């Protein structure tokens, strides 16, 4: 953990070749105290995230980390809320520009590829700090099917069968890895139940249909929809009865 | 943006930030480039930390033209930026000359960009070393561009973690009469020496350039080449 000069204040290399500012931006993701889990199925992709409403004064309809980037692409944001809104607005602009310039919907992989290209500049130029947010995009592709892509402050990006971000990212990753090792192409209900079970077991909350937001994309309707409290309650009851 | 250089000369006459970028490079995944008599092979350790990562979603060995390909060792996002830059420079050269860019010219332009990032204001050097393979004039070409913007013509070389022992292995295992398939065998052996665990068809990425052009090997072909190892 050696340092020499301003390697901890700007995005320049440390003596051992580390960008400490980027790592601090990564640590900034857990500042929000929220964990998001995305699971990809055989014909669907699901993003679930806990929504915290500390007081009844807050309008719970506005506390949403689920953002509709496009009709066919949804995202869940983890980390600083303002940086999350910035990344969401930039992703929406890039999707619209792709649709205008190329005439077809932007692929999910390329959306986060462009977003990570944008965020890499923040890790090379020293006049700006990296965004302390993590984007998880889900969308139904024309041929590849469901796609889940985590998209981090460093400009790294990768596809995922099931990923997680936030405070409990590692425990949820272990749970989802254990579930995936069983090698089951889960149906829509199974993917939703797996994501909800991952979040609940890792957090030990025994969710109510007001503490989580679920957004799904399916092959039959390749559009991003946010589940209502009744739809979430159906899955919660199904999980409880088993 | 800052207009002052972030890379400066130390009292000992060293571009310290470039050395630190090279240190970041030496901590990346191992990469091996071997120039055979009939082609070049670029192999890398594309190992993930969990099965949840989609192995085929992102590729470390990426093509630039129909005959030029790159494999990096260092930081992923910097390599993606340099991949886009190399592709754009190749498109500019093709548009100007109506001919695919020679490997040496693309290496020179990419190294010029990497040097620009060692002198321009408010930016840090790229934390990647690029192994560039191509085929021109019926002859194979292998180059390595370091963070400083310096390019070297290599018969066989290794970058990243455990690259010094990989180089020493390549000295005792490479001859100019090697064929492309034997070059792939040697590159896989070089990766295996620095590899920890077992190499599957998914946790390494291999690409080859020959008279037919550059193409990244599919996981099935990598599986056959790996079964050839054991």
């Amino acid at each position: 953990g050696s340092s020499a000069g301003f390697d901890r204040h700007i995005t320049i290399f440390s003596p051992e070749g580390r960008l400490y500012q980027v790592e601090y931006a990564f640590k900034a993701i857990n500042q929000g105290g929220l964990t998001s889990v995305a699971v990809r199925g055989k014909d669907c992709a699901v993003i679930v995230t806990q929504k915290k409403v500390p007081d009844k004064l807050l309008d719970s309809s506005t506390v949403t980390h689920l953002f509709k980037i496009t009709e066919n692409i949804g995202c869940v944001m983890t980390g600083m809320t303002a940086d999350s809104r910035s990344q969401v607005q930039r992703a929406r602009y890039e999707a619209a520009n792709w649709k205008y310039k190329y005439g077809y919907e932007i692929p999910v992989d390329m959306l986060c590829k462009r977003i990570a290209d944008i965020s890499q500049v923040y890790t090379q130029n020293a006049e700006m700090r990296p965004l302390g947010c993590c984007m998880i995009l889900i969308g139904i592709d024309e041929e590849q099917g469901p796609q889940v892509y985590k998209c981090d402050p460093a400009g790294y990006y990768c596809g995922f069968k099931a990923t997680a971000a936030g405070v409990k990212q590692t425990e949820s990753t272990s749970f989802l890895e254990k579930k995936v090792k069983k090698k089951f192409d889960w149906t829509f209900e199974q993917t939703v139940e797996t994501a909800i079970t991952c979040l609940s077991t890792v957090l030990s909350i025994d969710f109510k249909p007001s503490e989580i937001e679920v957004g799904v994309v399916t092959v039959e309707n390749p559009k991003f929809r946010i589940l209502t409290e009744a739809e979430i309650d159906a899955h919660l009851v199904a999980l409880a009865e088993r | 943006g800052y207009s002052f250089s972030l890379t400066t000369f130390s009292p000992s006459g060293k571009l310290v930030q470039i050395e630190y970028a090279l240190a970041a490079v030496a901590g990346g995944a191992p990469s091996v480039g071997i120039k055979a008599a009939n082609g070049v092979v670029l192999a890398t350790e594309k190992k993930q930390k969990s099965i949840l990562y989609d192995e085929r979603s992102v590729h470390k060995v990426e093509p630039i033209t129909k005959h030029i390909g790159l494999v990096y060792s260092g930081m992923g996002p910097d390599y993606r930026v340099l991949v886009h830059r190399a592709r754009k420079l190749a498109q500019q050269y093709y548009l100007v000359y109506q001919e695919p860019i020679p490997t040496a010219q693309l290496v020179q332009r990419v190294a010029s960009v990497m040097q620009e990032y060692t002198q321009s204001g408010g930016v840090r050097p790229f934390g990647v070393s690029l192994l560039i393979c191509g085929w021109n004039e019926g002859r194979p070409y292998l180059f390595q561009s370091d963070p400083s913007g310096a390019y070297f013509a290599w018969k066989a070389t290794a970058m990243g973690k455990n690259y010094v022992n990989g180089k020493t292995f390549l000295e005792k295992r490479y001859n100019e009469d090697l064929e492309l398939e034997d070059a792939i065998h040697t590159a896989i052996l070089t990766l295996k020496e620095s590899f920890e665990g077992q190499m599957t068809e998914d946790n390494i990425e291999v690409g080859i350039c020959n008279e037919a052009g550059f193409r990244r090997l599919t996981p099935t072909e990598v599986k056959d080449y790996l079964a050839a190892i054991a």
Binding site: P107, K113 | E62, K88
Partner: peptide, 7 residues
Amino acid sequence: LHSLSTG
């Protein structure tokens, strides 16, 4: 270029 980026 577009095809190379997309695949």
